[PDB]
Amino acid sequence: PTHLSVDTKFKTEGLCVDIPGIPKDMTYRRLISMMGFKMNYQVNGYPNMFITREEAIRHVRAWIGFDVEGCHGTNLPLQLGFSTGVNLVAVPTPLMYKGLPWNVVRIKIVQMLSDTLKNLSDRVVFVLWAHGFELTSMKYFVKIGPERTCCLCDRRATCFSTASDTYACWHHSIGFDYVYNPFMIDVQQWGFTGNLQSNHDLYCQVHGNAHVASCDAIMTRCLAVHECFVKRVDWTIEYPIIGDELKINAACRKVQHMVVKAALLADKFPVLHDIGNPKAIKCVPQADVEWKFYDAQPCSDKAYKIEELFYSYHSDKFTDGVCLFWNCNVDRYPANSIVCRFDTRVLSNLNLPGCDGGSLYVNKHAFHTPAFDKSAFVNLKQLPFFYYSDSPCESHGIDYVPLKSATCITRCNLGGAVCRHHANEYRLYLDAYNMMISAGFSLWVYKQFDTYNLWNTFT
Numbered sequence: 001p002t003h004l005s006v007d008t009k010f011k012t013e014g015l016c017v018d019i020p021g022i023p024k025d026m027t028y029r030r031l032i033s034m035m036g037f038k039m040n041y042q043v044n045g046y047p048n049m050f051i052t053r054e055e056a057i058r059h060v061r062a063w064i065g066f067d068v069e070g071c072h073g074t075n076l077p078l079q080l081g082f083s084t085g086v087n088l089v090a091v092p093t094p095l096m097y098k099g100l101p102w103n104v105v106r107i108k109i110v111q112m113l114s115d116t117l118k119n120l121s122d123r124v125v126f127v128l129w130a131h132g133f134e135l136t137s138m139k140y141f142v143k144i145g146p147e148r149t150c151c152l153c154d155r156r157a158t159c160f161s162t163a164s165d166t167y168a169c170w171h172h173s174i175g176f177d178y179v180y181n182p183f184m185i186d187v188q189q190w191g192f193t194g195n196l197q198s199n200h201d202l203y204c205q206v207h208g209n210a211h212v213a214s215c216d217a218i219m220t221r222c223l224a225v226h227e228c229f230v231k232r233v234d235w236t237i238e239y240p241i242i243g244d245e246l247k248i249n250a251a252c253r254k255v256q257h258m259v260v261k262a263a264l265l266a267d268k269f270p271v272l273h274d275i276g277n278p279k280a281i282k283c284v285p286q287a288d289v290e291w292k293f294y295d296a297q298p299c300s301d302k303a304y305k306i307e308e309l310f311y312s313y314h315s316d317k318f319t320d321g322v323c324l325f326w327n328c329n330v331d332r333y334p335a336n337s338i339v340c341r342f343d344t345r346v347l348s349n350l351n352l353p354g355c356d357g358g359s360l361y362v363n364k365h366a367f368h369t370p371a372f373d374k375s376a377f378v379n380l381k382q383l384p385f386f387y388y389s390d391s392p393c394e395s396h397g398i399d400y401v402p403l404k405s406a407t408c409i410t411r412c413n414l415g416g417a418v419c420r421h422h423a424n425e426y427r428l429y430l431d432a433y434n435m436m437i438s439a440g441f442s443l444w445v446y447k448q449f450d451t452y453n454l455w456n457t458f459t
């Protein structure tokens with residue numbers, strides 16, 4: 001039970017306005033045949049065009065919402081909309097394109113999908129709210145067959161070319177005209193009452209309905225993301241490495257250790273309240289401070305209300321010492337905080353668009369993150385870059401240009417000249433810091449934080 005059986009029933013009620021007379025009793029096998037595709041009894045890695053909700057979740061990076069609206073059915077122009085915001089008009093002869101024949105539309109579909117997906121996934125999963133026209137339009141741009149590899153590399157083939165009779169992955173498909181072995185899922189099979197807009201609007205106010213196909217495609221994928229990553233959360237699902245995951249996560253751990261260590265040295269807090277992940281370890285194990293942990297899993301719907309996290313009767317006094325909120329997203333941080341908050345607006349291959357302004361951050365695991373909000377940081381200030389170190393000035397064991405920096409807080413810099421070891425460590429730390437910032441993480445601190453207080457920690 002890993003793939004979706006072609007003999008599973010498909011509820012057809014949502015299809016009967018575009019396809020009147022459609023049988024109520026329908027399997028995926030009969031639906032695929034009706035869509036103009038022939039599976040030929042093939043045991044070659046592609047058992048069904050449609051996939052399970054569990055397979056869709058493992059391949060969330062491949063999700064592309066897709067909707068087709070009858071502009072005027074073999075005789076009428078169709079408006080093809082995608083969750084990329086693209087609308088194409090295909091004539092049978094928010095970007096809006098004029099009507100063109102299928103032979104040129106299919107070229108655009110392949111280019112659009114390849115550019116969107118080459119750095120995200122080895123496939124495409126068309127996410128539908130199936131009414132009929134989208135299913136019957138697939139024969140005009142989709143070819144199916146056995147699982148194949150790219151002509152130019154070892155990746156699985158996602159595109160086909162009728163000009164050269166060859167196959168390509170998303171990276172090598174320039175000039176290709178057919179989508180090859182795509183996957184799809186109909187959200188209407190999950191059990192909903194009412195239309196797409198009424199279900200989407202229950203959870204999201206950011207996607208409006210401009211009455212175009214791409215608006216529906218966007219809403220469909222958003223509703224699917226809400227169902228699979230907001231109301232349902234699965235942290236047992238692992239996702240492959242597609243970018244800087246390892247470096248970003250290592251940088252996050254380095255910056256956390258640096259910032260907390262310096263805050264403890266500068267303001268000598270007697271107690272630290274570490275609010276967040278229940279599997280957390282002390283980021284500064286050698287610190288004197290009374291370290292107290294409070295469990296809160298990453299919120300995936302709305303940011304935690306600080307009143308619920310702290311009140312209703314613990315140290316009780318969160319006002320004592322400092323609070324560390326390392327990726328624990330709250331509505332309004334208290335003034336005595338050290339905060340790392342992911343900015344959902346950041347563009348990257350790890351950060352996918354989400355529900356209600358939120359984003360789906362996929363780095364080893366999938367984390368739906370509530371929308372970034374600047375008002376959460378009103379009691380704090382942005383944490384400035386700095387490098388602090390009390391380690392001995394000693395090289396041990398990469399050429400050198402002397403480092404001059406006001407933010408290298410070391411004994412050598414206090415003494416007037418940065419040593420080679422602390423210059424190498426400063427540059428490595430600055431690289432880790434810039435990686436984490438560009439990855440989308442933002443850092444905030446209590447207003448009284450001042451790196452000038454670190455210089456006297458060397459006596």
Ligand SMILES: CCN(C)C(=O)c1cccc(N)c1
Pocket residue numbers: 248249252298326327342361363364367369
């Ligand atoms: C915004 C995602 N959250 C809540 C994290 O804690 C996280 C997840 C994966 C990687 C990293 N570095 C951080």
Ligand SMILES: [Zn+2]
Pocket residue numbers: 150151152153154155168169170171172
């Ligand atoms: Zn390739």
Ligand SMILES: [Zn+2]
Pocket residue numbers: 200204205206207218219222223354355356
């Ligand atoms: Zn939405």
Ligand SMILES: [Zn+2]
Pocket residue numbers: 392393394410411412413418419420421422
């Ligand atoms: Zn030094």
